[PDB]
Amino acid sequence: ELKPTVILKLLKENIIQMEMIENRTMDGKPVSLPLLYNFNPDNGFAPISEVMEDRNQRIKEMYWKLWIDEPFNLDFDPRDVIKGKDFEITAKEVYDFTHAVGNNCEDFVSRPDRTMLAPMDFAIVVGWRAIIKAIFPNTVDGDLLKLVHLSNGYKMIPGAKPLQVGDVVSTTAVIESVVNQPTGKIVDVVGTLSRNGKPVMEVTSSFFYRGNYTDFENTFQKTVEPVYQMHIKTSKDIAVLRSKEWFQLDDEDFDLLNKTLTFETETEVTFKNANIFSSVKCFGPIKVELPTKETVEIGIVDYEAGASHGNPVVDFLKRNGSTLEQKVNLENPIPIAVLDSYTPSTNEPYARVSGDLNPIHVSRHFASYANLPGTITHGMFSSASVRALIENWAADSVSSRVRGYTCQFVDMVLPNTALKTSIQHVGMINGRKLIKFETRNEDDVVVLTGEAEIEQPVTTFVFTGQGSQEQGMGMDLYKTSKAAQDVWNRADNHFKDTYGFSILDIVINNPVNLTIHFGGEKGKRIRENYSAMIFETIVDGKLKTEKIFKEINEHSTSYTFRSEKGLLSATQFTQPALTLMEKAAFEDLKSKGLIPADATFAGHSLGEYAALASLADVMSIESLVEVVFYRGMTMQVAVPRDELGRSNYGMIAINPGRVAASFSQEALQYVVERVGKRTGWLVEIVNYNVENQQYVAAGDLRALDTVTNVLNFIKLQKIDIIELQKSLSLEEVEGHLFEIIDEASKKSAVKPRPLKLERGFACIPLVGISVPFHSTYLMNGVKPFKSFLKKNIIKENVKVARLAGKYIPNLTAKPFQVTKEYFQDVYDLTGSEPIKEIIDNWEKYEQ
Amino acid sequence: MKPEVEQELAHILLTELLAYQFASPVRWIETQDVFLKDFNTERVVEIGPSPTLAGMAQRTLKNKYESYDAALSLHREILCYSKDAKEIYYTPDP
């Protein structure tokens, strides 16, 4: 429809009013902008002099009736927090926005029996009225037409959920820093969103009033600097710390040694000019890391300065302390995709949905009034048109993965232009992915730079136990990685200072004979460490503690370790190579920052020690290597061996999907329990690996040649146990099973004790092992490993937060919690006195 | 409960958990129902020199999560550290 856009007329005799009608409004009523001019007839060359006096507040009033539903007011100080009215999220507010911007996210669609999520660029829609209200006060004076929105970032805080439908999200804001550039004035304002009282995300907003501004009295810089952590390992930097006047302590004699100080530093900075600061004031708490991992206030940063050219406090800590979180690049940037997006014919679909009715987007007369080449598409729209393709690929079409998002507005765009965004992955940040985008139009010109801090998907870590033993495992990683170097060296140093051999030597060349010489003053500490290791076995039903190395005393000069082929075959040298090369692998991925902060981890048999030392670091790598060595020797002498070193125990790798089709995992446990009760020889399912396809049974060498022969008969007879016990007769299969077990166990007693264990049709004997571990065979040998574990794992280094919900044992196989019901479950599975000591005194610990 | 008491309870609990690993059967089948069902993990990253815990999780998903991973419609990226290091390091070939 053909609406009036301009009313040119005389207002008074000498005053022209050119008035510009804008129609698209909140209340349908078009708003007038009366641009006044003086017509001076005495100055014939340029008679039309614009009324510059009383101009910014008239532009303000016009914009107020397009952005601010409140009463027109400018006598509120910029420093003081600005509140937003409580804005809620509907399902309509998602459908209009997502269709307008083409955000084709199914998490933003209504799917049954799940909450509808909202776009992270809907948060500007939520909090435009609070964010933009920052620039309005008369001390933040400027021309809103020439005002260029420079940048606009989001930071979804760690631990809070992203926005959903219904969520009534209050808005607030405050002006971080207003600074008179030579080219204009950059106001940085942060406008957070608060749901259920708690903040959700911070929404950074850098605006630019282009011009020349002397109003330095109104400039300030209230920057809330990032926290800075620094380890106090020396008494040199302490003397440096005590010399720092800003650094004041509530306890002047507080032990700063070997602690960890975090600094929640905020610096206000007023100005004389753009360079010199009239007042610099760095303050905040100083938080020492208590062994419990919590952070307690021990002092105050309190810096006070006049004519300063920089923040000494930040200058000091940024060199001498860390940011709490250091990013790492990629070796090469990943060329994700060079995608194409199109700005829409009209800027009305976004202008309406957001409530940003800046006429330079819509009114061709306002657009050309500001010298723009036409009705400029919203920058924030282009922001949402590229973030949808950043939400499309890096986050695998997921919405909760998006944490950060910053988008600098560089080039002005007309409607109907063909963009070209080359998406470039640059590095990690503590698991999360850094994606750098660079939008160029049809003519190859930079329009939108910025990035997105996107969470990697939920990750689970499955640490291998034993298995394949190999010469030179992780030597390539050791040659390359800096973390792999550090961990192996540390391990090796601990080994040679504790156990008088090099772990590197063993994995590299695999010597047949290694001689530990107790030669000197150092040698004696190694001998005491070898004669300090104990185990407990049952002969004639007595709990006696036997000695590991029965041929080591205090007259023993040198011990020899032997192997038939190579020492990497013997469990006590095999397992420290595996757990070290895993820990090396993990400390290479952590160095590359590929580990999510909330990733679960469940270790297999031996891997659980690598996982715990990896994800928790509750014991040092020096503690881990000697823990797996002590267990590897305990897992050696636990069984009685002949003079040759062979024992009458061993493993099988049961495949129950090879004996019978209807052979359930209730049938293999029933057959193994019935065999153990009939033959009287120990056999137990010790590894629940894969359902009805992969198990491991641990027990006597005879006891694993009867269950194999029970499953060789059942396959060749085609008789099931679960059908006949139910549908034929009650407890008849119990009697009918003991005669098959009696037949299988009669032939398995004739052969001598070092018996060659057969590979069945549904059983594979796991060679290189002759110890029943993960069974009841080691009930006796548990007790001395407690006395071992207490010295090694220190209670101060155990972080409950790092273990909670992530550490999944192989005992209980649940999310680790500090609850009565979990300790009850661990007692029920493993009868222990110190578990029932807590359970009974549970309410005494509660208070 | 204090952080100090919660810390020593964690230290005690992990001590008997670790101590009774070799003294209890590895109930890993239903451990595979803690991170594939209870947490819904999309990357099963194995750490080790061979794919031992990779062929168990893929065959756990084929056996009894083909219809659970069709109901939620999620993709589980089953990798190892020895075999598929090109993908975890994010180091493709040009």
Curated annotation (Swiss-Prot), chain A:
<feature type="region of interest" description="Dehydratase">
    <location>
        <begin position="1"/>
        <end position="423"/>
    </location>
</feature>
<comment type="subunit">
    <text>[Alpha(6)beta(6)] hexamers of two multifunctional subunits (alpha and beta).</text>
</comment>
<feature type="domain" description="MaoC-like">
    <location>
        <begin position="320"/>
        <end position="445"/>
    </location>
</feature>
<comment type="function">
    <text>Fatty acid synthetase catalyzes the formation of long-chain fatty acids from acetyl-CoA, malonyl-CoA and NADPH. The beta subunit contains domains for: [acyl-carrier-protein] acetyltransferase and malonyltransferase, S-acyl fatty acid synthase thioesterase, enoyl-[acyl-carrier-protein] reductase, and 3-hydroxypalmitoyl-[acyl-carrier-protein] dehydratase.</text>
</comment>
<comment type="similarity">
    <text>Belongs to the fungal fatty acid synthetase subunit beta family.</text>
</comment>
<feature type="region of interest" description="Malonyl/palmitoyl transferase">
    <location>
        <begin position="424"/>
        <end position="642"/>
    </location>
</feature>
<protein>
    <recommendedName>
        <fullName>Fatty acid synthase subunit beta</fullName>
    </recommendedName>
</protein>
<feature type="cross-link" description="Glycyl lysine isopeptide (Lys-Gly) (interchain with G-Cter in ubiquitin)">
    <location>
        <position position="161"/>
    </location>
</feature>
<feature type="active site" description="For malonyltransferase activity">
    <location>
        <position position="605"/>
    </location>
</feature>
UniProtKB/Swiss-Prot annotation, chain B:
<comment type="function">
    <text>Fatty acid synthetase catalyzes the formation of long-chain fatty acids from acetyl-CoA, malonyl-CoA and NADPH. The alpha subunit contains domains for: acyl carrier protein, 3-oxoacyl-[acyl-carrier-protein] reductase, and 3-oxoacyl-[acyl-carrier-protein] synthase. This subunit coordinates the binding of the six beta subunits to the enzyme complex.</text>
</comment>
<protein>
    <recommendedName>
        <fullName>Fatty acid synthase subunit alpha</fullName>
    </recommendedName>
</protein>
<feature type="cross-link" description="Glycyl lysine isopeptide (Lys-Gly) (interchain with G-Cter in ubiquitin)">
    <location>
        <position position="37"/>
    </location>
</feature>
<feature type="modified residue" description="Phosphoserine">
    <location>
        <position position="50"/>
    </location>
</feature>
<comment type="similarity">
    <text>Belongs to the thiolase-like superfamily. Fungal fatty acid synthetase subunit alpha family.</text>
</comment>
<comment type="subunit">
    <text>[Alpha(6)beta(6)] hexamers of two multifunctional subunits (alpha and beta).</text>
</comment>
